[PDB]
């Protein structure tokens, strides 16, 4: 799998732990608590990882049939679908809506699947901390390029294409080297994107992690800064995570299900997906919906 040019010197972390499932009684009880917590909280940051794209047929890294998990035990990973053909999940779409109605301040993602951007989620409210298969970036001028198809390298290599930006004075092409945005093991995170995520998570008062085992830093430690500054922390993940001890609420369920219940408890529709819609800037906020009902 790192015949794709990447480092074989990586700490894959703890792979292949067994999946816990909350029984359906305790789940419903818990998701209700989350819904109250969302509505009740002013600034709410979400943290996504590979676990929210599993439903679309993209494997996780450290699950029972994760990429690293399978490599670590001598086996070919198993891809169901491609990155192009992969379709946003209920969670991807629920997240989109939660932004539209101001119930989500910021989104922090470790996923390189490109599907947050393709879900329609506004890029200016998203830090893609480990990169995006579809985004390439000019080395000279920093300008990014969201593509229809993958840029075709990883590890911050050059993709063999040049920057088409014509500059303010002169207006002749920049012609810098375009490179992928996919971080390799121990590559530095993106300055802008980490800064915004860091700020978002400090000043957030609810952090909700969805489908990450929280083993890779600094990404996986941002949800903790929320707590150190007096906030709450919800951890939605099937497996246990590295920071389970610090969670105000752990939920061990499918993330599509949790969000599906959450959006009902908040009385909100989960959009369908028309197809890939790159949205650079968030639209004007919709008005905040009716107050949630209490538990029946």
């Amino acid at each position: 799998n790192y015949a794709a040019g990447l480092s074989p010197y990586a700490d894959k972390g703890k792979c292949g732990l067994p999946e816990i499932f909350d029984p359906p009684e305790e789940l419903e009880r818990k998701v209700w608590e989350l819904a109250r917590l969302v509505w009740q909280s002013s600034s709410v940051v979400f943290h996504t990882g590979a676990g929210i794209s599993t439903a679309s047929g993209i494997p996780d890294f450290r699950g029972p049939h994760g990429v690293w998990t399978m490599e670590e035990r001598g086996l070919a990973p198993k891809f169901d679908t491609t990155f192009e053909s992969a379709r946003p999940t209920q969670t991807h779409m629920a997240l989109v809506q939660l932004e539209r109605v101001g119930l989500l301040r910021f989104l922090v993602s470790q996923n390189v699947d490109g599907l947050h951007v393709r879900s329609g989620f506004p890029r200016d409210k998203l830090a893609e901390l480990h990169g995006n298969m579809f985004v390439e970036e000019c080395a000279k001028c920093k300008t990014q390029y969201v593509r229809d198809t993958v840029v075709g390298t990883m590890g911050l290599k050059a993709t063999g294409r040049l920057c088409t930006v014509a500059k303010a004075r002169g207006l002749r092409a920049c012609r810098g080297e375009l490179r992928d945005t996919i971080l390799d093991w121990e590559d530095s995170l993106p300055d802008r994107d980490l800064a915004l995520a860091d700020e978002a998570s400090r000043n957030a008062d609810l952090s909700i992690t969805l489908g990450t085992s929280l083993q890779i830093r600094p990404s996986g430690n941002l949800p903790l800064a929320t707590k150190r500054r007096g906030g709450r922390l919800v951890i939605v993940n099937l497996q246990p995570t590295k920071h389970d001890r610090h969670a105000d609420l752990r939920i061990h369920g499918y993330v599509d299900e949790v969000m599906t219940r959450l959006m009902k408890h908040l009385g909100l529709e989960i959009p369908a997906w028309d197809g890939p819609r790159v949205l650079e800037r968030a639209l004007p906020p919709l008005p905040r919906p009716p107050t949630p009902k209490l538990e029946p």
Partner: peptide, 8 residues
């Protein structure tokens, strides 16, 4: 310089 790793 904030590197993607596991820290150990």
């Amino acid at each position: 310089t904030a590197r993607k790793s596991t820290g150990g």
